[PDB]
Design a protein around this ligand. Structure first.
Ligand SMILES: N#CC1(CS(=O)(=O)N2Cc3ccc(Cl)cc3[C@H](C(=O)Nc3cncc4ccccc34)C2)CC1
Ligand SMILES: N#CC1(CS(=O)(=O)N2Cc3ccc(Cl)cc3[C@H](C(=O)Nc3cncc4ccccc34)C2)CC1
Ligand SMILES: [Cl-]
Lengths: 305, 305
């Protein structure tokens, strides 16, 4: 029993975190094999950020201008290149702690673990989701740039996010490990804002199934709905549309609890129109949307890494 | 900016998890130096658990009855002894991945990270607190016994909890790393139930100071209160008494925000009376009590917004 916001064990990622310094700027790098990956804005001053020309700033740099520190050991930079908004530093030593890994680009609604780092040293681990507006609600202070997001599929670390910036609303933006931003953001000090956000419907449904598995059934009712009628109600409350793909993905949980997906949709409709009436679900007074159907199955079955 | 339920990076603990087998029973062990620590109920059958005589069950066991597996390597048990409710197995190999560590006994209200394991393999990491009734609200399935709770302040891992059992209400009970249970609980399947749980008042106050640091003041008011009048109100809402020790501990957060502890107590009294009226504090519609004053200082910025 129990249902907690759970992150993947971070050990395989901790062994890759390094400190990258370029002049007065210090941030975090990811050391895999003989390459260190970090945000390209490490080569900028506060002044450059206003309107940076990254190739022009990079051409003026030599290998010895980048200081890479792994623990208390200094690594030697023997090459440098740029791919989108990520700087790739070739080093003389391959990381002996390099795990089995892949670079993956995730979709909004997908969750991942974040290993927050400062000066190449991991400080904490938490779970979060890529919001429909492409931002993440992280917890990051100055110096956290270069911190990474990941998932573990069997024994392989899937790196999906690298941290670059904080928006005025306190939410966060970054790139995949190939340097492509999630969302309409740019790595420049200029006016940028998160768009209006929506609730991840398939995730709230998965979390309602996790509550049923744990004994919270007060919100169940005898009613059902059509997929079209549920989507008209979802549009009214700023919830993402539910597709037939989402219904198929919820199939295993629907069979385990004996509650059809459209039967659980009728419960969600009543919760939206009437509220919780002083009651809670899994210790929460809000409808939680940062657990995917896979996360629910994983936590209710004990999958190890 | 941001405020998340954050766990310590688990890497130092993942490198200590092993599988312990005794007959038909399999659970997790913690391998530090040349000793494996695990719950003593690993020597019991389901039948033994009603009224076990551990000394009598243990005297019938030899070193070669315990199978310890670290990764895909088998360890050799060369000694065994019992200390309170923990079994200590001496092995022929010292753990090369043993971190700098301490065994610490915590008080109710204190938080820690849990590395949930099955068959000696880590599955997830989450944050939780020792409830005032000495239980923890974890997320554990059968096979999770022997999973550990820890803090990693600075570079030293302080082990504070080892998982032993689930109570009928779905909550969890366990021991410190010296085998002493937290609470009036026994490693015996007897009529046992958690006492009435209460809210950790000093933690809710710390979390209100975090909300102020992150730029929110909607809940503050022009009032103050005496310590005694606050306690008479709080206990009617099932909140733990706030002691002078707790007031002293909140001193640093009070000086940073400029809000006196008894002024913050007045806001909490009003929030308990009025509810939130459709508003949230740090993304929550309930008052959060699983962040200590020390966790808030560790995560939040030193500059108030
Ligand atoms: N809005 C905003 C803020 C950011 S900033 O203006 O100081 N800043 C401009 C900027 C522009 C583009 C890029 Cl790619 C990076 C960056 C940097 C960036 O975001 N860094 C950070 C990242 N994370 C968490 C931070 C917390 C605190 C201060 C910086 C933080 C620096 C004030 C929060
Ligand atoms: N009530 C209850 C339950 C546990 S039990 O009755 O099967 N059980 C009695 C018992 C008594 C004392 C001691 Cl020391 C250990 C133990 C064991 C124990 O708690 N194991 C577990 C531990 N954690 C999480 C579990 C989840 C699911 C099943 C086992 C779980 C076995 C059914 C939840
Ligand atoms: Cl303590």
């Amino acid at each position: 029993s129990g249902f907690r916001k759970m992150a993947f064990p971070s050990g395989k990622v901790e062994g890759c975190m390094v400190q990258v310094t370029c002049g007065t700027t210090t941030l975090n790098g990811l050391w895999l094999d003989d390459v260190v990956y970090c945000p390209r804005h490490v080569i900028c001053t506060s002044e450059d950020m206003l309107n940076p020309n990254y190739e022009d700033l990079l051409i003026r740099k030599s290998n010895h201008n980048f200081l890479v520190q792994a623990g208390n050991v200094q690594l030697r930079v023997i090459g440098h290149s740029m791919q989108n908004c990520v700087l790739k530093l070739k080093v003389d030593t391959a990381n002996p702690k390099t795990p089995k890994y892949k670079f993956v680009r995730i979709q909004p609604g997908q969750t991942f673990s974040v290993l927050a780092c400062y000066n190449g040293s991991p400080s904490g681990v938490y779970q979060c989701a890529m919001r429909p507006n492409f931002t993440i609600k992280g917890s990051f202070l100055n110096g956290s740039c270069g911190s990474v997001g990941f998932n573990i599929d069997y024994d392989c670390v899937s790196f999906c996010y690298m941290h670059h910036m904080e928006l005025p609303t306190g939410v966060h933006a970054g790139t995949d490990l190939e340097g492509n931003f999630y969302g309409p953001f740019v790595d420049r000090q200029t006016a940028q804002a998160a768009g209006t956000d929506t609730t991840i419907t398939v995730n709230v449904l998965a979390w309602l199934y996790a509550a049923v598995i744990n004994g919270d059934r007060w919100f169940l009712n005898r009613f059902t709905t059509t997929l079209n009628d549920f989507n008209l109600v979802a549009m009214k409350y700023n919830y993402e549309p539910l597709t037939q793909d989402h219904v198929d993905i919820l199939g295993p949980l629907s069979a385990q609890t004996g509650i059809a997906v459209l039967d659980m949709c009728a419960s969600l409709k009543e919760l939206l129109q009437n509220g919780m009436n002083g009651r809670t679900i899994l210790g929460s007074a809000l409808l939680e949307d940062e657990f995917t159907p896979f996360d629910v199955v994983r936590q209710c079955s004990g999958v190890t890494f």
